[PDB]
Ligand binder design. Structure first.
Ligand SMILES: NC(=O)c1ncn([C@@H]2O[C@H](COP(=O)(O)O)[C@@H](O)[C@H]2O)c1/N=C/N[C@@H]1O[C@H](COP(=O)(O)O)[C@@H](O)[C@H]1O
Length: 245
């Protein structure tokens, strides 16, 4: 499944280089027609990150997210700044298909385990976004990726498997927003080690060949952000690539 992504800062569509808030490129303040064009090209799922909320959970763009979710007729997943059980419930009530959770899943696993019991594993996506160190450890970043948790992707996956973890979004932060290509070896590895998890690849797609390159990894979703904003290819072309590979 190709999953087009938009990232939002104070109403504006942005790209961050490797998630660095000091390295923005701006793409206007009309995300809704963008999403609607993605849906008309065939997108089956859409992904939204509230970057303002990820940086400060008190400043989440809640009215805007509601407007975007209500404005398309395909499932939308939303992340960025979610901290409480009430946060999750409100997003689901507003029509969000899946809520994406990074920071709190690392910091408070007892709490997030209770969310799995309440909402079900189909409603939650864990964002296990990583900076891979020189030893190979896949260290998960938190707080809008501004902090290194010092906890490995695998430790966190094993933490939530017994409560039915099903969906994981895994960004290679070094690739995010760079057009350099996604980390094929990373997804080959993690998908094979956890066949019961539906992984979404994330970060780095630069052209259609980069999508084709993921064909044998086993990922269930392919997130694409910057390349679609820059028009390297269309959603229609991306979908055709993934269907055929
Ligand atoms: N600093 C950051 O950029 C950042 N910080 C947090 N997130 C997301 O916020 C959510 C977690 O927020 P918390 O629960 O920690 O508050 C998750 O969705 C994280 O991935 C961030 N993700 C931003 N953008 C994603 O980066 C990838 C870029 O792809 P590309 O263009 O094709 O190269 C895509 O997955 C984009 O959606």
């Amino acid at each position: 499944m190709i999953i087009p992504a938009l990232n939002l800062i104070d109403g504006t569509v942005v790209r961050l280089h490797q998630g660095d808030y000091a390295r923005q490129r701006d793409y206007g303040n009309d995300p809704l027609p963008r999403l609607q064009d993605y849906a008309a090209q065939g997108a089956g799922v859409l992904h939204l990150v509230d970057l303002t909320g990820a940086k400060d959970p008190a400043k989440r763009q809640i009215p805007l997210i509601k407007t975007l979710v209500a404005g398309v007729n395909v499932p939308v997943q939303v992340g960025g700044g979610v901290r409480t059980e009430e946060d999750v419930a409100a997003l689901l009530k507003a029509g969000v298909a899946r809520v994406v959770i990074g920071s709190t899943a690392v910091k408070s696993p007892d709490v997030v385990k209770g969310w799995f019991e309440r909402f079900g594993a189909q409603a939650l996506v864990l964002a296990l976004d990583v900076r891979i160190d020189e030893h190979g450890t896949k260290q998960v970043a938190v707080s809008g990726w501004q902090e290194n948790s010092g906890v490995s992707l695998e430790q966190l996956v094993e933490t939530y498997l017994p409560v039915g973890l099903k969906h994981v979004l895994c960004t290679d932060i070094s690739r995010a927003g760079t057009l350099a290509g996604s980390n094929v070896s990373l997804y080959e590895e993690v998908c094979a080690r956890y066949p019961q998890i539906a992984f979404q690849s994330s970060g780095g797609i630069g052209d259609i060949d980069d999508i084709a390159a993921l064909r044998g990894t086993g990922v269930r979703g392919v997130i694409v952000g910057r390349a679609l904003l820059e028009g390297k290819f269309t959603v229609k072309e991306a979908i055709q690539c993934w269907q055929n590979v």
